[PDB]
Design a protein around this ligand. Structure first.
Ligand SMILES: CC(=O)N[C@H]1[C@@H](OP(=O)(O)OP(=O)(O)OC[C@H]2O[C@@H](n3ccc(=O)[nH]c3=O)[C@H](O)[C@@H]2O)O[C@@H](C)[C@H](NC=O)[C@@H]1O
Length: 189
């Protein structure tokens, strides 16, 4: 099969997907509805993709397009989920979900809670989320690749954030991504 990876290039993920004798193409720029990147694409995997996928593409690859989102949906849809999971003291984790119209609102395939520690920073928590979702994806990809799973509807509620929403809190990130998370718990409540 042919897998379209939307997001930055990741040799490990290419090699892993290519381990199942599938073809892998990568693209990280804005994707038009009629782009030839999509021809003969069996499955779309979005991971770090920084653009909204057109509803026409969504409906075309309905049930064949998943997104790796480093949040515990329905909480922290959209941008900067790791930061917001602390700013709003919400559940923390990673979710693999089918892609639908709207940002991070599709059916949930699998989730995993990720805990944190007293001396965690945004960097160490992000890295733990990354390792977890990448581990979680490899665990269930053999099952997902064969259409062996169906998702459950994402419960309404949770939360959603835009990139600009964090501007009012950047002053708390004294050490950038090396800022301890403890100084950020519930600061947005
Ligand atoms: C378009 C958009 O707004 N977000 C993307 C995507 O962005 P992402 O690929 O995660 O890259 P990011 O900008 O977050 O940071 C880049 C580097 O900064 C360091 N870092 C950052 C934040 C932190 O809390 N701690 C850190 O240490 C770290 O090293 C990281 O490699 O996140 C998804 C959740 C979004 N939705 C998916 O469904 C979108 O797909």
């Amino acid at each position: 099969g042919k897998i379209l990876l939307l997001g930055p290039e990741r040799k490990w993920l290419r090699d892993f997907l290519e381990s199942f004798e599938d073809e892998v193409t990568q693209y990280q720029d804005k994707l038009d509805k009629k782009s030839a990147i999509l021809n003969n694409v069996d499955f779309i995997i979005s991971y770090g993709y920084r653009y909204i996928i057109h509803p026409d593409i969504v409906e075309r690859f309905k049930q064949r397009a998943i997104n790796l989102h480093i949040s515990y949906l329905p909480w922290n849809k959209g941008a900067d989920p790791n930061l917001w999971s602390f700013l709003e003291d919400s559940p923390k984790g990673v979710t693999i979900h089918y892609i639908d119209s709207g940002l991070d609102t599709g059916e949930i395939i699998v989730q995993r809670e990720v805990t944190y520690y007293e001396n965690d920073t945004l960097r160490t928590t992000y890295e733990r989320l990354t390792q977890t979702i990448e581990k979680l994806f490899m665990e269930y990809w053999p099952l997902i690749r064969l259409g062996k799973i169906r998702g459950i509807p994402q419960p309404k509620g949770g939360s959603y954030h835009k990139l600009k929403d964090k501007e009012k809190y950047l002053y708390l990130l004294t050490d950038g991504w090396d800022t301890p998370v403890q100084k950020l718990i519930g600061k947005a409540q």
